[PDB]
Design a protein around this ligand. Structure first.
Ligand SMILES: CC(C)(C)NC(=O)[C@@H]1C[C@@H]2CCCC[C@@H]2CN1C[C@@H](O)[C@H](Cc1ccccc1)NC(=O)[C@H](CC(N)=O)NC(=O)c1ccc2ccccc2n1
Length: 198
């Protein structure tokens, strides 16, 4: 039941009698889905992430069947370009992040070394790119723009940047911006042999 990050980690979920594809996002606390038909009463919670914010309707004790494994918990519903399975449900259906093994009961944080500085970063199977907080980074970049849930943010795209994550090396592309969390995305994650399990 191993899954690599070379491609986006998508799974089939049965929720509300219907079928959707979703992303397994070790970088999200919460599970959020596109605008779909779910019965019951909800809570007007607001969710936050890069690019800004978005409002969603909170449901509790909703049943969801991910890759044919049942789980019950809080699903959230609002405008998301992607269906996302966050950590609340991953923990339950038993998902582990291996590379020895990181559980999702807490946020998967590692300490990385980049540009001679030490930082704490989030292991995010839900991100295709690696985005770091604003820091001093020598070299040359190009002015790429990127998007999350609450909108979009401008960031500097340095390439060939070297990083030591939890005691392994990887050279690759890093982005630097106004993000509140350091994100280790799937591009560097693939180079250090992280995988998902059941
Ligand atoms: C990094 C980048 C390349 C931009 N990709 C992404 O950001 C993609 C974009 C995708 C398409 C749109 C829908 C979201 C998905 C998943 N995201 C990654 C995805 O992993 C994103 C990573 C992240 C973490 C923390 C803060 C910001 C952003 N997580 C999230 O958006 C989830 C939403 C949720 N769980 O309710 N955010 C959080 O879990 C979360 C946790 C702590 C926080 C503290 C302060 C402020 C915000 C905080 N947000």
């Amino acid at each position: 039941p191993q899954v690599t990050l070379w491609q986006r980690p998508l799974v089939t979920i049965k929720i509300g009698g219907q079928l959707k594809e979703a992303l397994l996002d070790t970088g999200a606390d919460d599970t959020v889905l596109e605008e779909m038909s779910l019965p019951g009463r909800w809570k007007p919670k607001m969710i936050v992430g890069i690019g800004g914010f978005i409002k969603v309707r909170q449901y509790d004790q909703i049943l969801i069947e991910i890759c044919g494994h049942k789980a019950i918990g809080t699903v959230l519903v609002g405008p998301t370009p992607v269906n996302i399975i966050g950590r609340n449900l991953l923990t339950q259906i038993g998902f582990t992040l291996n590379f020895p093994q990181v559980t999702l009961w807490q946020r998967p944080l590692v300490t990385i070394k980049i540009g001679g500085q030490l930082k704490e970063a989030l292991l995010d199977t839900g991100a295709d790119d690696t985005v770091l907080e604003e820091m001093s980074l020598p070299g040359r970049w190009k002015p790429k723009m990127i998007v999350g849930i609450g909108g979009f943010i401008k960031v500097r795209q340095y390439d060939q940047i070297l990083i030591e994550i939890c005691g392994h090396k990887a050279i690759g592309t890093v982005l630097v911006g106004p993000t509140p969390v350091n994100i280790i995305g799937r591009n560097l994650l693939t180079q250090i042999g992280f995988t998902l399990n059941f």
